[PDB]
Amino acid sequence: PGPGHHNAHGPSCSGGVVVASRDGKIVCENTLDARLDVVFRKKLPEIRKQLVS
Amino acid sequence: YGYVRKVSGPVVIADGMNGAAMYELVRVGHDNLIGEIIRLEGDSATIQVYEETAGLMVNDPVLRTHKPLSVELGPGILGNIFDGIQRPLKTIAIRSGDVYIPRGVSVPALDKDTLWEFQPKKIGEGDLLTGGDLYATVFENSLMQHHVALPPDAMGKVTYVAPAGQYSLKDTVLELEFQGVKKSFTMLQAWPVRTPRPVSSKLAADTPLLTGQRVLDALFPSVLGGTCAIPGAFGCGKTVISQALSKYSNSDTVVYVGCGERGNEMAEVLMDFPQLTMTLPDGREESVMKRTTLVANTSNMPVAAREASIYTGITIAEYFRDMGYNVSMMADSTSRWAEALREISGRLAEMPADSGYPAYLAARLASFYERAGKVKCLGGPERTGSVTIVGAVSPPGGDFSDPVTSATLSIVQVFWGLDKKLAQRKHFPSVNWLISYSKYSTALESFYEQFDPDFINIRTKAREVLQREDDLNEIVQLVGKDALAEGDKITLETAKLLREDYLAQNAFTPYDKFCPFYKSVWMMRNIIHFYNLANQAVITYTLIKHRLGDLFYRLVSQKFEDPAEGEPALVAKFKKLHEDLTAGFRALE
Amino acid sequence: EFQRKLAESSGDSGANVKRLEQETEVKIHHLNAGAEKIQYDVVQMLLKHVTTVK
Amino acid sequence: EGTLEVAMEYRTVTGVAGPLVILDKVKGPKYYEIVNIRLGDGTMRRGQVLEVDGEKAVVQVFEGTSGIDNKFTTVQFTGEVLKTPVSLDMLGRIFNGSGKPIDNGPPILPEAYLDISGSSINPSERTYPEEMIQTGISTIDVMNSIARGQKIPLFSAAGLPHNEIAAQICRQAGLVKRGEEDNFAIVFAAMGVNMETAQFFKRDFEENGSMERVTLFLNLANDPTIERIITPRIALTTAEYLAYECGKHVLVILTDMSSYADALREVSAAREEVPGRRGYPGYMYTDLAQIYERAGRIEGRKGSITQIPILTMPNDDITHPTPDLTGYITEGQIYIDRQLQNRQIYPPINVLPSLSRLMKSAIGEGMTRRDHSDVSNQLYANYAIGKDVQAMKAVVGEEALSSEDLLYLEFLDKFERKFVAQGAYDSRNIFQSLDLAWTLLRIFPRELLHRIPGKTLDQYYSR
């Protein structure tokens, strides 16, 4: 269907795509912002370990 | 939009409600039967309807409300009479004319066509306001001025302010815009009963609830914004204490809440309140209804309304406290509320717990009771109110072992303990000193010492005297008064005098209808100081008893004095009597 | 005697407060050294955010 | 490393009932996966997926099912069990039931994410508690002592000062000192406490100046009932990280364990599980194990977790399921008597039912005295005989107390008067108290004493 009617906003969504089945019941919000949030929350202990020492 | 599919007694299943939300109240059928949503299985819903569901038709319409069980607050909330589900009984009776409550009444909670005098604060048309800001106040009636607080969860820069004048609730008294979008607010605020009211900070209670009765004021004090418990089942003590709270308590408002009691008992109490009248300290005479709100749900009322009456009342009390007023709720029968909850649980087939009550009974009672307390307001200007609950308990046969009683005793800080034995012995206060307690005395000690540093020591001495009273009781029981020493005899006589002169009140008598804390403190001083002064002289008990007849008469009359003379005169008289008693005790020694 | 004993406290508490303020400033300078650790580690964790594969 | 994945957000919620939220068409669920539910209004709340069957999922929301629409709410499957971001910096702070920092402070920067309900310690690697503790109260230390690694609760009915006793113990907590870095760090769980009690705890802890070494996990009665179950889990997980993974000994405290029992009962009744005694879940023993059965000392590490729960008999009955199961699991009891409170005793510890199953190892020659065991046994056993003498006097008369029974009655009177009573801030040392304990045992003749040998106390000398 594409963004032909509505689209992820530019500054609010730096990039990436979202893929959802019919009727939008199941959605996989695979955008770059969410990817960064997840990787940040996962790698935070490494960040703390490297900030010290 | 929405049609019923299965109607099995109270339970109702309605299709075509995919957008329905859990615990969202709904209107069922042409008769506008009101019920709450329980399970949203599939695209269908599930509703338990409060009133009788007899006569429902399959495919009869079901109309959503998009709101949980909520109460419409605002002007006109005081004085009226409301059902458990926030139904104005008086206006319903006037409109329908007949006496019976119609099955499916749709009268709004407050009359939206009546006019109230409105005047805004000094706020400007383009200022900034936030949730909880007091932007106007309304003279709903004389001497009960009603502040109009901007509803919480609403904020933004001011756009329009209604100038002072005559207005109704349907008028758009306020309009403002937070973002580019603008919202207009009327004088009516809706709030769900289950959700508490937003608070800024839970303060520490620091002011006693002066009930006007000496036994509650001094022996077992209760603090503003503090829970209270009454084992009220007979002796009319609950009625007496409720009347005392309505007439003389420091609270600016009272919200009685009656659930599931005898219908004629509620008739008697709801006819008693209008007859009750209280005089102003400025000499004015008012009616208690002008500051009283009443939520009465008899046994004939639907069980769900009986369960929801308590939450309705506590939400009303919280709304009153939102403008910093001190308000006191009075749950008539928590045992009836627990029985209603048990019936609802049995309807839902929830797994039974101890003695048959559902496992969440203690948790829900604690959640309800935790709403009481002195709280800083939300939004400016700065002010602070309080909500105190004096909810009573009705243990079965007086055995404080039922789960309702146990949970209440575990949660409530102050338990006053009315005793039927005292009522049999013709005791007007009927408060059993042997079982009552006030766990808030440690926090109240600051004010107790600020008023009088010796008052707390006097209270401790009185507690010791009461503890020794039962000791002397079995002493007389086993050997008699002969074995009592002179000091023991003096202690016993002083305990008896305290019980029959100060610890007991006369209620009906005009002189002892209301006991000011000043008179109570002077009486306690004139009793305890005399007790000590007689005690250290041990002197023959018979001799001092003979020579203290005038002192004994003065001590007895230290409570017979009417409050007409006022605090300056009565305090002087009590001080003179105490000085005379001290001189008589010391000179004759 | 009690007032004389407590007079030294009015200075001791202030000295302890000043010492605590200086220690907090030094700890933040270690967080400014952490800001130096930032200067040495910001590029590191920014290149750690290359998880843009598959 | 395996490439990351963004959590799938579902909207197929197809049923709500009780506290359980049903889902359908779930693509690859995971048991006990934490799911945060976003309602149509936009507010968010957490929840766990209780039962996973086929492509369905029966989620138990935390903040309550109210406000969930079968066609507007969205559920996001994080794909990982609940984990508490434990860190050494967490010391000296206050957290909500789930762990939200409520001290107006920045959130925890985790040194490591650790899953709650950590695996058991291999009992081959488990060791035995071998050191006494200086709490600061006489009667607990002198008799039925507490070992550095021993679990033992406080039995105390409602209205009793057990909260004040807990606060005093936490503020006066310390090692025997017979070090500050490894000194007692106290994790203070608070399950279902009143608001006034919460403010009291906060003020008392801030006043003692030991905020630098105490963590509060406050959970008020206003908070959701399910969120109270995870509070002890989080507290014990943080304690495990502090003790085993950092070294410092932890003195875990949980108040109102009966509130936790009530939360378990409510949750079980919600899901309609098989009920044990008094309607409690049939697995309450296992849950109370997973809470209590973590105190101990691990061989390879110098840490130690000491557990001091605080129960409350509902009907003041020891036979209630919660205290009974606890006593089955908790390795001893320190008992508090309402009857002694009626006598205006500030620490109403009744010693007759109070025994420490690990006291036989806490005592010895490295600490205490060589007559500790026998003196404790005598002051434990003669109290029962004094109580029997009192009962006989009540049912017969004052003349029933013979030349021997009257001695037991006087022993009981002096024992309840002087020995048990103590100051609200008195740190009564063991030897000074053991001298008075010897005097109490010596009220009875030095030859009628049956269990104790004369030589044991004879090694010690008066004055």
Side-chain angles (χ1 to χ4, degrees), chain B residues 391-398 401 403-412 414-418 422:
Chain B
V393 60
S394 310
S401 68
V404 194
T405 75
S406 308
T408 299
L409 288 169
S410 84
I411 305 151
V412 172
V414 177
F415 172 79
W416 279 341
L418 306 186
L422 296 175

PDB file of all heavy atoms in Angstrom, chain B residues 391-422, unseen atoms left out:
ATOM      1  N   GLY B 391     -16.121   5.624  59.428  1.00  0.00           N
ATOM      2  CA  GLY B 391     -16.879   4.441  59.072  1.00  0.00           C
ATOM      3  C   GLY B 391     -17.016   3.430  60.192  1.00  0.00           C
ATOM      4  O   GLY B 391     -16.026   3.047  60.819  1.00  0.00           O
ATOM      5  N   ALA B 392     -18.243   2.996  60.445  1.00  0.00           N
ATOM      6  CA  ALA B 392     -18.541   2.092  61.543  1.00  0.00           C
ATOM      7  C   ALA B 392     -18.449   0.639  61.091  1.00  0.00           C
ATOM      8  O   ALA B 392     -18.332   0.331  59.906  1.00  0.00           O
ATOM      9  CB  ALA B 392     -19.930   2.385  62.109  1.00  0.00           C
ATOM     10  N   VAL B 393     -18.503  -0.263  62.067  1.00  0.00           N
ATOM     11  CA  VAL B 393     -18.468  -1.697  61.818  1.00  0.00           C
ATOM     12  C   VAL B 393     -19.581  -2.342  62.633  1.00  0.00           C
ATOM     13  O   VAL B 393     -19.978  -1.833  63.685  1.00  0.00           O
ATOM     14  CB  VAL B 393     -17.089  -2.301  62.170  1.00  0.00           C
ATOM     15  CG1 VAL B 393     -16.761  -2.080  63.637  1.00  0.00           C
ATOM     16  CG2 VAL B 393     -17.017  -3.778  61.806  1.00  0.00           C
ATOM     17  N   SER B 394     -20.097  -3.461  62.131  1.00  0.00           N
ATOM     18  CA  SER B 394     -21.161  -4.211  62.797  1.00  0.00           C
ATOM     19  C   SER B 394     -20.726  -5.665  62.908  1.00  0.00           C
ATOM     20  O   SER B 394     -21.150  -6.516  62.113  1.00  0.00           O
ATOM     21  CB  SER B 394     -22.486  -4.082  62.046  1.00  0.00           C
ATOM     22  OG  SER B 394     -22.783  -2.723  61.773  1.00  0.00           O
ATOM     23  N   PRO B 395     -19.872  -5.984  63.878  1.00  0.00           N
ATOM     24  CA  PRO B 395     -19.437  -7.365  64.040  1.00  0.00           C
ATOM     25  C   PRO B 395     -20.609  -8.257  64.389  1.00  0.00           C
ATOM     26  O   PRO B 395     -21.558  -7.828  65.073  1.00  0.00           O
ATOM     27  CB  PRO B 395     -18.425  -7.284  65.191  1.00  0.00           C
ATOM     28  CG  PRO B 395     -18.797  -6.048  65.935  1.00  0.00           C
ATOM     29  CD  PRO B 395     -19.280  -5.093  64.890  1.00  0.00           C
ATOM     30  N   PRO B 396     -20.592  -9.509  63.935  1.00  0.00           N
ATOM     31  CA  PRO B 396     -21.683 -10.430  64.279  1.00  0.00           C
ATOM     32  C   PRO B 396     -21.653 -10.831  65.745  1.00  0.00           C
ATOM     33  O   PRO B 396     -20.704 -11.478  66.201  1.00  0.00           O
ATOM     34  CB  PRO B 396     -21.433 -11.629  63.357  1.00  0.00           C
ATOM     35  CG  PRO B 396     -19.969 -11.586  63.082  1.00  0.00           C
ATOM     36  CD  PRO B 396     -19.596 -10.132  63.048  1.00  0.00           C
ATOM     37  N   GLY B 397     -22.685 -10.445  66.490  1.00  0.00           N
ATOM     38  CA  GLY B 397     -22.752 -10.775  67.899  1.00  0.00           C
ATOM     39  C   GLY B 397     -21.677 -10.147  68.753  1.00  0.00           C
ATOM     40  O   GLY B 397     -21.469 -10.587  69.886  1.00  0.00           O
ATOM     41  N   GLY B 398     -20.988  -9.131  68.243  1.00  0.00           N
ATOM     42  CA  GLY B 398     -19.929  -8.478  68.981  1.00  0.00           C
ATOM     43  C   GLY B 398     -18.591  -9.183  68.947  1.00  0.00           C
ATOM     44  O   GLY B 398     -17.632  -8.681  69.546  1.00  0.00           O
ATOM     45  N   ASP B 399     -18.492 -10.324  68.268  1.00  0.00           N
ATOM     46  CA  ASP B 399     -17.240 -11.068  68.189  1.00  0.00           C
ATOM     47  C   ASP B 399     -16.350 -10.419  67.138  1.00  0.00           C
ATOM     48  O   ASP B 399     -16.596 -10.553  65.935  1.00  0.00           O
ATOM     49  CB  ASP B 399     -17.512 -12.532  67.855  1.00  0.00           C
ATOM     50  N   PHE B 400     -15.308  -9.716  67.587  1.00  0.00           N
ATOM     51  CA  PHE B 400     -14.381  -9.041  66.682  1.00  0.00           C
ATOM     52  C   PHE B 400     -13.423 -10.054  66.050  1.00  0.00           C
ATOM     53  O   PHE B 400     -12.213 -10.048  66.276  1.00  0.00           O
ATOM     54  CB  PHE B 400     -13.625  -7.946  67.424  1.00  0.00           C
ATOM     55  N   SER B 401     -13.999 -10.942  65.240  1.00  0.00           N
ATOM     56  CA  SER B 401     -13.238 -11.962  64.536  1.00  0.00           C
ATOM     57  C   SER B 401     -13.593 -12.084  63.063  1.00  0.00           C
ATOM     58  O   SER B 401     -12.831 -12.710  62.318  1.00  0.00           O
ATOM     59  CB  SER B 401     -13.430 -13.334  65.201  1.00  0.00           C
ATOM     60  OG  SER B 401     -14.757 -13.796  65.032  1.00  0.00           O
ATOM     61  N   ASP B 402     -14.714 -11.522  62.621  1.00  0.00           N
ATOM     62  CA  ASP B 402     -15.082 -11.587  61.219  1.00  0.00           C
ATOM     63  C   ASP B 402     -14.052 -10.845  60.368  1.00  0.00           C
ATOM     64  O   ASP B 402     -13.454  -9.864  60.821  1.00  0.00           O
ATOM     65  CB  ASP B 402     -16.468 -10.987  61.002  1.00  0.00           C
ATOM     66  N   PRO B 403     -13.822 -11.300  59.134  1.00  0.00           N
ATOM     67  CA  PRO B 403     -12.773 -10.676  58.312  1.00  0.00           C
ATOM     68  C   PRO B 403     -12.965  -9.185  58.112  1.00  0.00           C
ATOM     69  O   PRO B 403     -11.978  -8.441  58.064  1.00  0.00           O
ATOM     70  CB  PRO B 403     -12.875 -11.445  56.990  1.00  0.00           C
ATOM     71  CG  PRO B 403     -13.415 -12.769  57.387  1.00  0.00           C
ATOM     72  CD  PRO B 403     -14.410 -12.473  58.470  1.00  0.00           C
ATOM     73  N   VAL B 404     -14.212  -8.726  57.999  1.00  0.00           N
ATOM     74  CA  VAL B 404     -14.462  -7.292  57.897  1.00  0.00           C
ATOM     75  C   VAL B 404     -13.946  -6.582  59.139  1.00  0.00           C
ATOM     76  O   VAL B 404     -13.214  -5.587  59.052  1.00  0.00           O
ATOM     77  CB  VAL B 404     -15.963  -7.028  57.683  1.00  0.00           C
ATOM     78  CG1 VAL B 404     -16.190  -5.593  57.238  1.00  0.00           C
ATOM     79  CG2 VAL B 404     -16.533  -8.016  56.683  1.00  0.00           C
ATOM     80  N   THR B 405     -14.310  -7.096  60.316  1.00  0.00           N
ATOM     81  CA  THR B 405     -13.872  -6.484  61.566  1.00  0.00           C
ATOM     82  C   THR B 405     -12.358  -6.527  61.705  1.00  0.00           C
ATOM     83  O   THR B 405     -11.737  -5.539  62.114  1.00  0.00           O
ATOM     84  CB  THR B 405     -14.533  -7.185  62.750  1.00  0.00           C
ATOM     85  OG1 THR B 405     -13.914  -8.461  62.952  1.00  0.00           O
ATOM     86  CG2 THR B 405     -16.010  -7.393  62.477  1.00  0.00           C
ATOM     87  N   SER B 406     -11.747  -7.666  61.373  1.00  0.00           N
ATOM     88  CA  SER B 406     -10.303  -7.799  61.517  1.00  0.00           C
ATOM     89  C   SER B 406      -9.569  -6.831  60.600  1.00  0.00           C
ATOM     90  O   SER B 406      -8.637  -6.140  61.026  1.00  0.00           O
ATOM     91  CB  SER B 406      -9.882  -9.240  61.232  1.00  0.00           C
ATOM     92  OG  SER B 406     -10.642 -10.153  62.003  1.00  0.00           O
ATOM     93  N   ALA B 407      -9.986  -6.757  59.335  1.00  0.00           N
ATOM     94  CA  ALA B 407      -9.346  -5.832  58.408  1.00  0.00           C
ATOM     95  C   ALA B 407      -9.538  -4.389  58.853  1.00  0.00           C
ATOM     96  O   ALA B 407      -8.593  -3.591  58.818  1.00  0.00           O
ATOM     97  CB  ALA B 407      -9.894  -6.038  56.998  1.00  0.00           C
ATOM     98  N   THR B 408     -10.750  -4.039  59.290  1.00  0.00           N
ATOM     99  CA  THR B 408     -11.000  -2.675  59.739  1.00  0.00           C
ATOM    100  C   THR B 408     -10.116  -2.319  60.927  1.00  0.00           C
ATOM    101  O   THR B 408      -9.513  -1.242  60.960  1.00  0.00           O
ATOM    102  CB  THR B 408     -12.477  -2.506  60.097  1.00  0.00           C
ATOM    103  OG1 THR B 408     -13.281  -2.750  58.937  1.00  0.00           O
ATOM    104  CG2 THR B 408     -12.748  -1.101  60.606  1.00  0.00           C
ATOM    105  N   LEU B 409     -10.008  -3.224  61.903  1.00  0.00           N
ATOM    106  CA  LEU B 409      -9.143  -2.967  63.048  1.00  0.00           C
ATOM    107  C   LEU B 409      -7.678  -2.898  62.638  1.00  0.00           C
ATOM    108  O   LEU B 409      -6.892  -2.185  63.272  1.00  0.00           O
ATOM    109  CB  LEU B 409      -9.346  -4.044  64.111  1.00  0.00           C
ATOM    110  CG  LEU B 409     -10.670  -3.973  64.870  1.00  0.00           C
ATOM    111  CD1 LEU B 409     -10.885  -5.230  65.699  1.00  0.00           C
ATOM    112  CD2 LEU B 409     -10.716  -2.731  65.745  1.00  0.00           C
ATOM    113  N   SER B 410      -7.294  -3.625  61.588  1.00  0.00           N
ATOM    114  CA  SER B 410      -5.908  -3.584  61.138  1.00  0.00           C
ATOM    115  C   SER B 410      -5.586  -2.290  60.403  1.00  0.00           C
ATOM    116  O   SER B 410      -4.438  -1.835  60.434  1.00  0.00           O
ATOM    117  CB  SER B 410      -5.613  -4.784  60.241  1.00  0.00           C
ATOM    118  OG  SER B 410      -5.999  -4.521  58.904  1.00  0.00           O
ATOM    119  N   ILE B 411      -6.568  -1.687  59.741  1.00  0.00           N
ATOM    120  CA  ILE B 411      -6.335  -0.483  58.952  1.00  0.00           C
ATOM    121  C   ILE B 411      -6.634   0.783  59.744  1.00  0.00           C
ATOM    122  O   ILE B 411      -5.880   1.754  59.669  1.00  0.00           O
ATOM    123  CB  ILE B 411      -7.160  -0.526  57.649  1.00  0.00           C
ATOM    124  CG1 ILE B 411      -6.850  -1.797  56.862  1.00  0.00           C
ATOM    125  CG2 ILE B 411      -6.873   0.698  56.800  1.00  0.00           C
ATOM    126  CD1 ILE B 411      -8.003  -2.285  56.018  1.00  0.00           C
ATOM    127  N   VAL B 412      -7.722   0.795  60.511  1.00  0.00           N
ATOM    128  CA  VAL B 412      -8.162   2.020  61.164  1.00  0.00           C
ATOM    129  C   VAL B 412      -7.224   2.363  62.313  1.00  0.00           C
ATOM    130  O   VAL B 412      -6.866   1.501  63.126  1.00  0.00           O
ATOM    131  CB  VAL B 412      -9.611   1.878  61.651  1.00  0.00           C
ATOM    132  CG1 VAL B 412      -9.994   3.061  62.500  1.00  0.00           C
ATOM    133  CG2 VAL B 412     -10.548   1.761  60.467  1.00  0.00           C
ATOM    134  N   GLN B 413      -6.814   3.631  62.379  1.00  0.00           N
ATOM    135  CA  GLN B 413      -5.915   4.077  63.437  1.00  0.00           C
ATOM    136  C   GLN B 413      -6.629   4.213  64.778  1.00  0.00           C
ATOM    137  O   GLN B 413      -6.087   3.803  65.811  1.00  0.00           O
ATOM    138  CB  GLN B 413      -5.266   5.405  63.047  1.00  0.00           C
ATOM    139  N   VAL B 414      -7.834   4.779  64.791  1.00  0.00           N
ATOM    140  CA  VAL B 414      -8.539   5.104  66.024  1.00  0.00           C
ATOM    141  C   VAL B 414      -9.841   4.317  66.077  1.00  0.00           C
ATOM    142  O   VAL B 414     -10.693   4.457  65.193  1.00  0.00           O
ATOM    143  CB  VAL B 414      -8.819   6.613  66.132  1.00  0.00           C
ATOM    144  CG1 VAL B 414      -9.622   6.913  67.387  1.00  0.00           C
ATOM    145  CG2 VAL B 414      -7.518   7.396  66.123  1.00  0.00           C
ATOM    146  N   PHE B 415     -10.003   3.514  67.126  1.00  0.00           N
ATOM    147  CA  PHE B 415     -11.213   2.732  67.343  1.00  0.00           C
ATOM    148  C   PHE B 415     -11.839   3.165  68.662  1.00  0.00           C
ATOM    149  O   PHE B 415     -11.183   3.119  69.705  1.00  0.00           O
ATOM    150  CB  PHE B 415     -10.897   1.235  67.354  1.00  0.00           C
ATOM    151  CG  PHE B 415     -12.051   0.370  67.762  1.00  0.00           C
ATOM    152  CD1 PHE B 415     -13.061   0.075  66.866  1.00  0.00           C
ATOM    153  CD2 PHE B 415     -12.113  -0.168  69.035  1.00  0.00           C
ATOM    154  CE1 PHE B 415     -14.120  -0.727  67.234  1.00  0.00           C
ATOM    155  CE2 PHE B 415     -13.168  -0.972  69.409  1.00  0.00           C
ATOM    156  CZ  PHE B 415     -14.173  -1.251  68.507  1.00  0.00           C
ATOM    157  N   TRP B 416     -13.106   3.573  68.614  1.00  0.00           N
ATOM    158  CA  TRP B 416     -13.750   4.189  69.767  1.00  0.00           C
ATOM    159  C   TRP B 416     -14.549   3.213  70.619  1.00  0.00           C
ATOM    160  O   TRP B 416     -14.714   3.453  71.818  1.00  0.00           O
ATOM    161  CB  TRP B 416     -14.658   5.338  69.314  1.00  0.00           C
ATOM    162  CG  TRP B 416     -13.894   6.596  69.050  1.00  0.00           C
ATOM    163  CD1 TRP B 416     -12.642   6.895  69.493  1.00  0.00           C
ATOM    164  CD2 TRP B 416     -14.326   7.726  68.281  1.00  0.00           C
ATOM    165  NE1 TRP B 416     -12.266   8.139  69.054  1.00  0.00           N
ATOM    166  CE2 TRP B 416     -13.282   8.670  68.306  1.00  0.00           C
ATOM    167  CE3 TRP B 416     -15.491   8.031  67.576  1.00  0.00           C
ATOM    168  CZ2 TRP B 416     -13.369   9.896  67.654  1.00  0.00           C
ATOM    169  CZ3 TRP B 416     -15.576   9.247  66.928  1.00  0.00           C
ATOM    170  CH2 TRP B 416     -14.521  10.165  66.971  1.00  0.00           C
ATOM    171  N   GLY B 417     -15.055   2.131  70.037  1.00  0.00           N
ATOM    172  CA  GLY B 417     -15.602   1.038  70.819  1.00  0.00           C
ATOM    173  C   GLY B 417     -16.812   1.338  71.682  1.00  0.00           C
ATOM    174  O   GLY B 417     -16.709   1.334  72.912  1.00  0.00           O
ATOM    175  N   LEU B 418     -17.959   1.599  71.062  1.00  0.00           N
ATOM    176  CA  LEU B 418     -19.194   1.712  71.825  1.00  0.00           C
ATOM    177  C   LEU B 418     -19.563   0.358  72.420  1.00  0.00           C
ATOM    178  O   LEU B 418     -19.462  -0.678  71.756  1.00  0.00           O
ATOM    179  CB  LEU B 418     -20.327   2.223  70.937  1.00  0.00           C
ATOM    180  CG  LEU B 418     -20.071   3.522  70.173  1.00  0.00           C
ATOM    181  CD1 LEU B 418     -21.334   3.977  69.457  1.00  0.00           C
ATOM    182  CD2 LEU B 418     -19.563   4.606  71.109  1.00  0.00           C
ATOM    183  N   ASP B 419     -19.992   0.370  73.679  1.00  0.00           N
ATOM    184  CA  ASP B 419     -20.304  -0.849  74.413  1.00  0.00           C
ATOM    185  C   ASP B 419     -21.783  -0.875  74.766  1.00  0.00           C
ATOM    186  O   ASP B 419     -22.320   0.111  75.282  1.00  0.00           O
ATOM    187  CB  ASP B 419     -19.460  -0.956  75.685  1.00  0.00           C
ATOM    188  N   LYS B 420     -22.436  -2.005  74.489  1.00  0.00           N
ATOM    189  CA  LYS B 420     -23.842  -2.153  74.847  1.00  0.00           C
ATOM    190  C   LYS B 420     -24.027  -2.265  76.355  1.00  0.00           C
ATOM    191  O   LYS B 420     -25.106  -1.946  76.870  1.00  0.00           O
ATOM    192  CB  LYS B 420     -24.438  -3.373  74.150  1.00  0.00           C
ATOM    193  N   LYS B 421     -22.999  -2.722  77.076  1.00  0.00           N
ATOM    194  CA  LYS B 421     -23.101  -2.831  78.527  1.00  0.00           C
ATOM    195  C   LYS B 421     -23.299  -1.464  79.169  1.00  0.00           C
ATOM    196  O   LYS B 421     -24.115  -1.311  80.083  1.00  0.00           O
ATOM    197  CB  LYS B 421     -21.858  -3.516  79.092  1.00  0.00           C
ATOM    198  N   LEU B 422     -22.558  -0.459  78.701  1.00  0.00           N
ATOM    199  CA  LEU B 422     -22.745   0.895  79.209  1.00  0.00           C
ATOM    200  C   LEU B 422     -24.131   1.423  78.868  1.00  0.00           C
ATOM    201  O   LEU B 422     -24.761   2.107  79.685  1.00  0.00           O
ATOM    202  CB  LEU B 422     -21.664   1.816  78.651  1.00  0.00           C
ATOM    203  CG  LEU B 422     -20.234   1.487  79.085  1.00  0.00           C
ATOM    204  CD1 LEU B 422     -19.242   2.391  78.377  1.00  0.00           C
ATOM    205  CD2 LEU B 422     -20.094   1.606  80.593  1.00  0.00           C
TER     206      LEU B 422
END
